[PDB]
Chain length 142, copies 4
């Protein structure tokens, strides 16, 4: 199995406050499950080659997704911003697979990624444990 | 908009204790979002014609999904049991649409449904507010 | 250290639906802390001789407390029903100590307790692991 | 009645990551209750003259309390850092009343408070809605 444990940091009240509105798990590698403990989120997966997505909404209405997973035994991540309401995590997660438009990002196997949304919100994913089967990352808003 | 608020009742410790492991929202009707308040779960949707799925796992390893949504202005529900680990909610939610194998169940527009899993766990969805745009249901395990 | 992990089973929608409104830890035995994981609640304590209280409120307005702890190396529990709004868990938890009016209930070292409230709600605490330092109980509202 | 809604912003992973370990409500003003919705926390109280406390623990072991309440119709707040394990919120909340050692801090009726702990963690409580019965504050760990 692989697990990825996320801690969510929110830095700047002027950007609003984000909460989870959806959580998906892709079906490869025997799937996987999200769980919560002590204010953290863990994605547990059946092997290498799958992922999951958290979609967040701020109290100012902004919608963004965070994807994390393992590709060929190495962690990967992505963040998509500026989402329309119909672009649910259920739409986004499969776009990393089957030659979809985000597959290239998975294939980069990034240990960190940074993006600012068009409305001005910074998002970062930073793995703090970057090797092995029990991975850890901080997700930082603002 | 439509909302569906769920309260989860668990009746029988011998069946184990279930917790959420995934939550999806289908992309029709401008999508929608899950939220939590006072121990309840609300699916808020952009209009009639979409749905969302909660997948649960028990501490005995059982995997089941609960689907709720609105079809032609009337509520619907379904429960799928006996799931394999790769049959994530991301797999299940779309099966209600595009002539998929569960579409017939959505089309029934049920206000209640009951199923027992092969391993012997009873599940019921029962709408308590069955008309209008702010719907309410109890989800009962065991 | 001692821990007590609780699983809350709400059986009967006719009683309404309860959620936590307060969680206290008494200061003996070097204190302790509440945590949440996978829908369960764990009280971790620094030794034998202390306790904590969860207060619950139903969506019908009912207020009740559940107390769990370890006294002379044996688990104990209590449920207090029919509470007024001013009788917060902060009021109730100390009543088990310093010769307070609930000390005798702690002293019973009960592994199970059953009580039905003035509005008809049945409550049960039943330890499923009843010895050792890693205690487990089901809390059932019926 | 009065309510205080809190949004918790954790800014700085170097301080570790905090989660709630206790939540108390003082018994004046007909008590009150904590609730959670969309990742936020609301203390609802029966009138002016009471308060509640959230105790937090970091994954590095740090223990701190945040107190919020209403005194003579004006909001107040406090943050206590450097706590020992035996100094539970159940110990701290009463210290604001009955001529206890923290009463003067309640009496200040602060709309903002800033303190840095012995291990270097910066804490701020800043009310964003500072008047009326529906109060709002940001709690920032930095």
């Amino acid at each position: 199995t692989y697990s990825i444990t996320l801690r969510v940091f929110q830095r700047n009240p002027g950007r609003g406050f984000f909460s989870i509105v959806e959580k998906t798990v892709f079906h490869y590698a025997n799937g996987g499950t999200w769980s919560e403990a002590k204010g953290t989120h863990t994605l547990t997966m059946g092997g290498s080659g799958t992922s999951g997505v958290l979609r967040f909404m701020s109290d100012k209405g902004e919608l963004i997704t965070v994807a994390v997973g393992v590709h060929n035994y190495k962690r990967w991540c992505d963040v998509v911003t500026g989402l329309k309401p119909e672009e649910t995590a259920l739409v986004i997660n499969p776009q990393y697979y089957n030659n979809g438009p985000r597959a290239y990002t998975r294939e980069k196997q990034l240990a960190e990624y940074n993006v600012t949304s068009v409305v001005g919100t910074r998002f970062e994913v930073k793995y703090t444990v970057v090797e092995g089967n029990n991975l850890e990352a901080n997700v930082i808003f603002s």
